[PDB]
Symmetry: C2
Subunit: 125 residues, 2 copies
């Protein structure tokens, strides 16, 4: 129960740290950051509600983290303005590394790679 994918408190921490980190990085307009921030806080409140009901599990937390990450990559790839796609991608990636350092202290690089690949996937669709 030592990771955001297994511990609901860490999952919440992860999403909060992501947003805090991202808020000082380039590529995003004020609306985009607001949009991301609103979705982050929705996801966090949702995990808290589920944890209180004993309704999180590694499988669900895992799916919910992917939901958070995908939603972020979605906003960056489909909302125009603020900076280049590559800047936006670097910022997501950099905000994710910190979120890991802030939580587990261990960067999950393949997961970060997976999210940048998504930003590109969504961009092309």
């Amino acid at each position: 129960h030592t990771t955001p994918w297994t511990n609901p408190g860490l999952a919440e921490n992860f999403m909060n740290s992501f947003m805090q980190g991202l808020s000082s990085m380039p590529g995003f307009t004020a609306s985009q950051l607001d949009n991301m921030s609103t979705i982050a806080q929705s996801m966090v409140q949702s995990i808290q509600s589920l944890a209180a009901q004993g309704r999180t599990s590694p499988n669900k937390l895992q799916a919910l983290n992917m939901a958070f990450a995908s939603s972020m990559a979605e906003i960056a790839a489909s909302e125009e303005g603020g900076g280049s796609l590559s800047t936006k991608t670097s910022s997501i990636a950099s905000a994710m590394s910190n979120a890991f350092l802030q939580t587990t202290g261990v960067v999950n690089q393949p997961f970060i790679n997976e999210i940048t690949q998504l930003v590109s996937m969504f961009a092309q669709a």
Copy 2:
């Protein structure tokens, strides 16, 4: 044009239709479906809470619909059992298609394509640690 992210009612109806539908398709164990259901109602509830405050917009709902769909794709790709990966993918796609039809009345095939790509992508990757 009219999409599941056009407004909060359409967003929630879409998610509810996906579930009810996929719940009658092959490829999934009962606990994969219940995991899907748990997450879907959790996002319905999230959208309701945001809408109550006038905090939705088509950008935000579009991001939330992708949050919904990617999590369905994750559970399908990563939870073992129930049936083939090819069948799971077919069921997700027909359930999204029907959910469009029940909701807006118009299938978004490029959206269904990217969700089937996600299933394929998430099965390759995994969620390790």
